[PDB]
Amino acid sequence: MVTQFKTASEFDSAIAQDKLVVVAFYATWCGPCKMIAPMIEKFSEQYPQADFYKLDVDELGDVAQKNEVSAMPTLLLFKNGKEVAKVVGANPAAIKQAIAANA
Fold first, then answer.
1. CATH architecture group of domain 1-103
2. What separation in angstroms does the CA of 103 have from each of 6, 66, 79?
3. Contact predicate 8/55, CB 8 Å
Protein backbone atom coordinates (compact mmCIF):
# COMPACT_ATOMS: atom_id res chain seq x y z
CA MET A 1 0.00 0.00 0.00
CA VAL A 2 1.07 3.61 -0.46
CA THR A 3 1.50 5.91 2.54
CA GLN A 4 -0.15 9.27 3.02
CA PHE A 5 1.89 11.96 4.76
CA LYS A 6 0.29 14.44 7.14
CA THR A 7 2.74 17.34 6.90
CA ALA A 8 4.76 19.14 4.28
CA SER A 9 7.54 18.28 6.70
CA GLU A 10 6.92 14.56 6.18
CA PHE A 11 6.99 15.05 2.42
CA ASP A 12 10.01 17.37 2.56
CA SER A 13 12.05 14.96 4.68
CA ALA A 14 11.16 12.10 2.35
CA ILE A 15 11.91 13.85 -0.92
CA ALA A 16 15.13 15.29 0.53
CA GLN A 17 16.52 11.79 0.87
CA ASP A 18 19.02 10.36 -1.61
CA LYS A 19 16.30 7.99 -2.68
CA LEU A 20 13.42 8.06 -5.14
CA VAL A 21 10.36 9.47 -3.41
CA VAL A 22 7.26 9.78 -5.54
CA VAL A 23 4.44 11.52 -3.71
CA ALA A 24 1.00 12.19 -5.23
CA PHE A 25 -1.24 15.04 -4.22
CA TYR A 26 -4.79 13.74 -3.93
CA ALA A 27 -8.24 14.82 -2.91
CA THR A 28 -11.54 13.29 -1.86
CA TRP A 29 -13.37 15.23 -4.56
CA CYS A 30 -11.81 13.73 -7.69
CA GLY A 31 -12.55 10.83 -10.01
CA PRO A 32 -9.09 10.42 -11.71
CA CYS A 33 -7.41 10.00 -8.33
CA LYS A 34 -9.78 7.10 -7.75
CA MET A 35 -8.87 5.08 -10.87
CA ILE A 36 -5.09 5.47 -10.58
CA ALA A 37 -5.42 4.88 -6.84
CA PRO A 38 -5.76 1.05 -7.29
CA MET A 39 -3.32 1.22 -10.22
CA ILE A 40 -0.60 3.04 -8.31
CA GLU A 41 -1.48 0.67 -5.47
CA LYS A 42 -0.10 -2.10 -7.66
CA PHE A 43 2.82 -0.05 -8.94
CA SER A 44 3.71 0.84 -5.39
CA GLU A 45 3.74 -2.85 -4.65
CA GLN A 46 6.30 -3.23 -7.44
CA TYR A 47 8.70 -0.61 -6.05
CA PRO A 48 11.11 -2.42 -3.68
CA GLN A 49 13.87 0.21 -3.59
CA ALA A 50 11.70 3.19 -4.44
CA ASP A 51 8.85 4.52 -2.37
CA PHE A 52 5.33 5.56 -3.22
CA TYR A 53 3.32 8.06 -1.21
CA LYS A 54 0.05 9.87 -1.91
CA LEU A 55 -1.07 12.95 0.06
CA ASP A 56 -4.43 14.63 0.65
CA VAL A 57 -4.03 18.04 -0.96
CA ASP A 58 -6.83 19.42 1.22
CA GLU A 59 -4.53 18.90 4.18
CA LEU A 60 -1.34 19.36 2.19
CA GLY A 61 -2.44 22.50 0.43
CA ASP A 62 0.50 24.70 1.36
CA VAL A 63 3.04 22.10 0.23
CA ALA A 64 1.03 21.64 -2.96
CA GLN A 65 1.29 25.39 -3.52
CA LYS A 66 5.04 25.20 -2.98
CA ASN A 67 5.23 22.75 -5.84
CA GLU A 68 2.62 24.80 -7.74
CA VAL A 69 0.29 21.81 -7.96
CA SER A 70 -2.82 22.69 -9.96
CA ALA A 71 -3.93 19.17 -10.90
CA MET A 72 -5.27 16.13 -9.07
CA PRO A 73 -3.57 13.85 -8.70
CA THR A 74 -0.06 15.16 -9.32
CA LEU A 75 2.84 12.72 -9.41
CA LEU A 76 6.24 14.09 -8.59
CA LEU A 77 9.18 11.86 -7.88
CA PHE A 78 11.88 13.66 -5.99
CA LYS A 79 15.55 12.92 -5.52
CA ASN A 80 17.71 14.65 -2.89
CA GLY A 81 15.09 17.39 -2.87
CA LYS A 82 16.28 18.33 -6.35
CA GLU A 83 13.54 16.31 -7.99
CA VAL A 84 13.93 13.54 -10.55
CA ALA A 85 10.77 13.81 -12.67
CA LYS A 86 7.46 15.59 -12.92
CA VAL A 87 4.09 14.36 -14.14
CA VAL A 88 0.93 16.33 -13.59
CA GLY A 89 -2.41 15.14 -14.90
CA ALA A 90 -3.68 11.87 -13.39
CA ASN A 91 -0.99 9.44 -14.49
CA PRO A 92 -1.49 5.74 -13.69
CA ALA A 93 0.37 4.67 -16.83
CA ALA A 94 2.50 7.80 -17.23
CA ILE A 95 3.70 7.37 -13.66
CA LYS A 96 5.56 4.41 -15.07
CA GLN A 97 7.20 6.89 -17.44
CA ALA A 98 8.76 8.82 -14.56
CA ILE A 99 8.75 5.96 -12.16
CA ALA A 100 10.50 3.38 -14.28
CA ALA A 101 12.90 5.81 -15.91
CA ASN A 102 13.99 7.35 -12.60
CA ALA A 103 13.26 4.95 -9.70
1. 3-Layer(aba) Sandwich (3.40)
2. 23, 23, 9
3. no
